[PDB]
Amino acid sequence: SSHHHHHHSMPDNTIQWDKDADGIVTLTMDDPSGSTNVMNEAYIESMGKAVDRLVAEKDSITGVVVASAKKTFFAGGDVKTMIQARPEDAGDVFNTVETIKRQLRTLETLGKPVVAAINGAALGGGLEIALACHHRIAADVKGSQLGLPEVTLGLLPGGGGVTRTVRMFGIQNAFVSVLAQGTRFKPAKAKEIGLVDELVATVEELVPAAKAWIKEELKANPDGAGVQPWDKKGYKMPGGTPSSPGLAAILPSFPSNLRKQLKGAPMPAPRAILAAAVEGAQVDFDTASRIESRYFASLVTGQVAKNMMQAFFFDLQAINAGGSRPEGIGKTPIKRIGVLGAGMMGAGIAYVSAKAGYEVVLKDVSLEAAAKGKGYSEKLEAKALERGRTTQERSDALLARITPTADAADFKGVDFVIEAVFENQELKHKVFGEIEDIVEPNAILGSNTSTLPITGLATGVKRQEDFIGIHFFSPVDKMPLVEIIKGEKTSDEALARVFDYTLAIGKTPIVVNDSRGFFTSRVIGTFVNEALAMLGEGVEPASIEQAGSQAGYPAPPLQLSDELNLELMHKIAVATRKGVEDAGGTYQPHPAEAVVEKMIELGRSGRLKGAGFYEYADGKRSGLWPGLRETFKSGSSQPPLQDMIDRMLFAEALETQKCLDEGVLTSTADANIGSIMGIGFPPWTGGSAQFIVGYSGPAGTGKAAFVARARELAAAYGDRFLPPESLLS
Amino acid sequence: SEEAFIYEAIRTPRGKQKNGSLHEVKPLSLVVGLIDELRKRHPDLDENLISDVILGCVSPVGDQGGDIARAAVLASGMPVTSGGVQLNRFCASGLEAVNTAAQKVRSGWDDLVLAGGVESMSRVPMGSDGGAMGLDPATNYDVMFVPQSIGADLIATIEGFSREDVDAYALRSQQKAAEAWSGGYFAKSVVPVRDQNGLLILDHDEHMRPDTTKEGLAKLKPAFEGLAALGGFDDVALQKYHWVEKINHVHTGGNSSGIVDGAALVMIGSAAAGKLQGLTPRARIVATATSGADPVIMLTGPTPATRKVLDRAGLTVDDIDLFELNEAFASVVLKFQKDLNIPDEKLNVNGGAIAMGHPLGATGAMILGTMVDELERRNARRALITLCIGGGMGVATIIERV
Amino acid sequence: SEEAFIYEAIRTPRGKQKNGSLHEVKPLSLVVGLIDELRKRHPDLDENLISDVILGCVSPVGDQGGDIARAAVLASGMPVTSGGVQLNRFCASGLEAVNTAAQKVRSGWDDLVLAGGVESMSRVPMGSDGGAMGLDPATNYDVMFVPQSIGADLIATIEGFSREDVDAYALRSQQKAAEAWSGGYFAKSVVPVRDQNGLLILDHDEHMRPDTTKEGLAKLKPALGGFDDVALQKYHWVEKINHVHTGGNSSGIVDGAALVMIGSAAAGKLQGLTPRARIVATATSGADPVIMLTGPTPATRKVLDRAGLTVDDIDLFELNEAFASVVLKFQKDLNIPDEKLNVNGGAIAMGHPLGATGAMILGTMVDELERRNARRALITLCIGGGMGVATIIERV
Ligand SMILES: Cc1cc(NS(=O)(=O)c2ccc(N)cc2)no1
Ligand SMILES: Cc1cc(NS(=O)(=O)c2ccc(N)cc2)no1
Ligand SMILES: Cc1cc(NS(=O)(=O)c2ccc(N)cc2)no1
């Protein structure tokens, strides 16, 4: 029991000290090793010294204030250290957070009020530092965020977040609002829920208001000065304890409702958070704080955390830091965007571009269709007005930047073209040829293409330099990725301009070299085809959709195959079959092609035609087609569920390795985030490329185990599951 | 080695949940009333030879806590050497008490044992004891916890039992239960509950709706008045039964077991035990068996448990004259009838829990004594009693008339 | 016919009540840990042959409610056909599960049965389950409800056991418990408790104060009703009760669990198990509910008549140390030799996890019979409500 990390036998200091004549100590956190105060090894020793000093000088201290000399307050911990935690290191991980919380618990139980001077982002461990204080004041500055986003990296609030939030709101409210999804809160919303107590205008008022609150608290509340609501005799947990009849009547539904939302996916972080929350509410605070450490060390030494910390931190850093951007290029600002086609894609592109503040001209083949494309943006603002997520003052200016038109000359003054017309090559040459001269000379000529190579599409314009592939995903207002495709004659400045445009509209870009199918639409093709081949093999459609959901996908494959349209899936196979037979070869068709063609013969080719694998009525989706079982003899093949799951995951992971080999993708970061944010790859895998190096099956863990499981699938289902030589020796 | 015999098997009427007659009666007083009734039958019986009193209780809290069997032994003035113990095996606790009492006699180290159960669900509702399988998110995940309501609908979904099918059995139970009461079948085994002044409190199974019609059961709504109305359990159940697309919620409050209060008592003893006390045997415990099933459907347990008890006795399905399955849910009985090809004239011939109620810890001993009296009335030989258990278990027992 | 044999008898360490190491550990996870140890010892054991799992639990509420046995079967991944039932006969619930399991094997309708008990008294305190015998004014008058501490003081008052006499046995239990730990007696039968990461939580008995002195025991001190007046109303020939029982001469409140594998000779032969002891006989008796703690004497005599044995035929006597006067009363009645009674410590030193105690001291005698190469042992406990149990085992 010591505030320091070593009882035996040299880090820097990150906390300043200042005691005043009144007796208030101002602990100003200022880590010199970086611009952001993190929960690294230096902070632990720095705080260990300060807390030891708060005790030895407790006779001359009346209150404490915790401030920060950075732009943010205290954003997160040392991810570079946690990602290396082996199962052998479980003892050190347990002792670490137990030492961290031992410091906060003494600060919390000091007999003196402690106020937090939240001057910016208090994310993760930073909010855990603030929750240990007795009062919290946040500066209502721009960019400030407060939350516990430990679950997004595969971890849990292990510095007392789970224990203290449950002590403030109860098991149910703390889990849903803060813990389960790790949602980030604005300073106004943080005060509204209970995370923050007061607000100020600027940061220069925090420390004065902090010391002022200490003086009034010691004046009007001398007995309860520096005592948390749970350290008092009559603490009643809001919502009750697990031994309360009202909560016991609904407590068994929390693991089922959580499994209902996770769709049976192998994500142990939310499951462990709910466990630590309920187990914590049964015992005292210190006993609950220790249980929180054990569940935390259970996640850090695991594999899912190492995948989510690799993708949603390290891989996301390199992308947002210009890893795929072409180097040594300036920023050419955008003034007016012109979207060609007002379909589901073109209207979604016009919304996300106008929501960022860009003037967009929405052109289609008629005013009836162009204005109806703008209606896609109007029908979403009416949803944001009812939910109260935007104002009428800021929403009327949003729709005012969308100018629907049918005349091509209205594209004058456009320095950014984003075409979203039908998947037809000579049509895109026809569409670009009509307006290539009306737009500004040095304008970006983008194309929302799914499979046609950009090198071929660029022949229909005069300036092949500024012709690039800007691939979006429907619905554009929610899908956060933009796959940028670099053609052969595509320059480097066009890569950087679309790269900056992607970050300007709040999305994540990846750079992909020109190839048939690119990376997103190609890899997702191997996903829906493994399910369609599985259906033709005689597997129950209900088992296929269940296997797709339990793998971690946001939508089951047959449901996705109805929204991807089966007639386009038939065109891709004919195009691929043509290219092989045009080159004088022998095409080996996929077993899913016969399943696609059978659905065309029956007239059920997806949602667009009111009928697909599912029955559709009244706009919504009814259920699986009853005629699907008798058509494919569903039930005559009952493979194990894990084989269905692995056949879908391995098909994409193996296909992703080919993109890295063929030069399609240039980095493992674009492969992971591009698959997660693009085609909806399960986040627990950390990406389709991380899935290989971090595979955890019953036979082993790592690349050697991935190859072994691939060979099990290869010998039992087909040679398509054979790993390439890039994964062997 | 020693043969265990049933000498007396009585029970109390089952009082309904809402505005029930047995609500004002402490569950301990329900057992003492049955103990005093046995003394009324055999006043010269030396109670010192009674070595144990075993009661089944699924919610042993509050009025049913602290070894309620021992409270019955002490409050009723029974000899202090008569022991007392409670056991909990969910819905089959009433029969597990008799099977354990029978096994206690076969070992030779216990001669005369009282067995039964008590459950006052209007005073101690289900789940009042809590449990790790329900109130622990770690355990609630490893054990895919799904209440019995969904498992019953899942059985009717897989086997293809329509809403009219399960409601047809509900009318079938109410009809046969009324014929048994009106026919006087229960006149001598249902001890009416009285107060400290001998005033009548209840003398019939007041949960019975005898004038039930098929049109009345169709108007009932599917079950949404418990933990099932919350959500997720359908998604959790289908995550294991991934080949099923939709669960057809067909079980309502009229085709499921009734929430009632009651108690039952059975006296099990050896051949030499009843001889010394002057007791005439009524039936013989032939064999018992216990086999479980998948914990998500959790109600298909009676199917293997019935086969293991038939194989131990060297008997087939054709050798049993009467079948008594607890009417927890209609699909549980239709599944049991469809599997083992049980003839309709042998299955719960005197109604069941859908009509008369299901007092958890006491049901196993109630439907046991029902067959002991029906074997004598029909003058038949063998009867098999089985129940479905929570968590995916099963218990079956074969009795032979003497 | 079918004789019952004990193949494995393990138990968890006992964590003390206040600031105990097992306070953060759910009672269910204690039972699962012992199931995993049996898997480690017999990995090729066919768990499908295990037909029932019987556990004793005096307070089956909260973390211990909802048939904790069945929860131990499903959470540990055991076959669903392995049963799972919970029973409660107050202090002897742990041994009652063993006896019932043996009687299930003798009847022939069960082949391989796990028995034991669990009681996390720091999470589920005693009396949390309520009880009509104590919380109903009608019953609390008919049974003359009195706590067991007063029945123990009534024993010492009638028999003439002084405060020094009961503190002498308290010191004696602490000395023999530490000598057993130091000698490695409990080395194989005490399975340490670890968390979900493998980190150690407990590997010894925390309630043991091995440096106990006779001067410190006398410093200890001996409760809101007229239970004294209620007790003396039946025992009218004694004027005043001498309260000689304190926290140092009574059973310890701790958390812990215990597991025992019981089967027939054909069950172990088919599954490659070697019997360690044979359940010779069991017996159930009782005594008036005021004194309550005099059940062992008639129950032990009853189990001797069945087996046709006497005190001179038994090698070891193991009585649960609920109170010091209970053991001195049992020793004085049957003239038990002082070197055969609780030879490896007792509940005063190590603790009394109610539902798991009868199964702990059961396996404790299995070890000492095999360590001394002895033959027989008699395990008995005093029971609340005025009951008594007794079991004779024979080493094989
Ligand atoms: C998600 C996501 C991306 C994506 N790409 S896509 O270009 O829409 C596409 C179209 C047809 C086929 N067969 C596959 C992918 N589709 O869904
Ligand atoms: C709540 C609650 C308790 C309860 N008891 S139960 O029905 O006996 C049960 C036991 C085990 C499992 N897995 C499911 C249900 N059912 O719901
Ligand atoms: C409290 C509490 C529980 C409890 N149970 S007990 O000690 O087992 C007990 C049982 C019956 C009688 N007559 C007296 C005591 N006694 O007090």
Residue numbers in the entry:
A (entry chain A): -13 to -5, 1 to 720
B (entry chain D): 2 to 403
C (entry chain C): 2 to 223, 230 to 403
Task: Give verbatim excerpts from the published study on this entry.
The Mycobacterium tuberculosis trifunctional enzyme (MtTFE) is an α2β2 tetrameric enzyme in which the α-chain harbors the 2E-enoyl-CoA hydratase (ECH) and 3S-hydroxyacyl-CoA dehydrogenase (HAD) active sites, and the β-chain provides the 3-ketoacyl-CoA thiolase (KAT) active site. Linear, medium-chain and long-chain 2E-enoyl-CoA molecules are the preferred substrates of MtTFE. Mtb is capable of switching its metabolic preference during the latent stage of infection in order to utilize host-derived fatty acids as a source of carbon rather than glucose or glycerol. The Mtb genome encodes an unusually large set of enzymes of the β-oxidation cycle; however, only a single trifunctional enzyme (MtTFE) that catalyzes three of the last four reactions in the β-oxidation cycle is present in Mtb, in contrast to other bacteria such as Escherichia coli, which has two TFEs. Here, 226 fragments were screened in a crystallographic fragment-binding study of MtTFE crystals, resulting in the structures of 16 MtTFE–fragment complexes.
The six fragments that bind in the substrate-binding pocket are B-E1, M-1, M-53, M-76, M-83 and M-109. Fragments B-E1 and M-83 form hydrogen bonds either to Serα512 or to both Serα441 and Serα512, both of which point into the catalytic site. These fragments also make weak interactions with the side chain of the catalytic Hisα462. B-E1 and M-83 interact weakly with the side chain of the catalytic cysteine Cysβ92. The R-SO2-R and R-SO2-OH moieties of B-E1 and M-83, respectively, bind at the same site, forming a hydrogen bond to the side chain of Glnβ149, as visualized in Supplementary Fig. S2 for the M-83 fragment. The five-membered ring of fragment B-E1 points away from the acyl-tail binding tunnel towards the KAT225 loop of the thiolase β-subunit (contacting the Leuβ228 side chain) and the H9A helix of the α-subunit (in particular Proα243). Leuβ228 and Proα243 line the groove between the I2 site and the K2 site. A single fragment (B-51) binds at the CoA-A(HAD/KAT) binding site (two binding events), one fragment (M-53) binds at the CoA-B(ECH2) binding site (one binding event) and five fragments (B-E1, M-1, M-49, M-53 and M-72) bind at the CoA-C(ECH/HAD) binding site (I2; 13 binding events). The distances from the ECH and HAD active sites to the I2 site are approximately 21 and 12 Å, respectively, and the corresponding distance from the KAT active site is approximately 44 Å, when considering the distances between the bridging pyrophosphate O atoms of the CoA molecules bound at these sites. The path is identified by the fragments B-E1, B-H11, M-1, M-49, M-53 and M-72, in addition to the CoA-C(ECH/HAD) molecule.
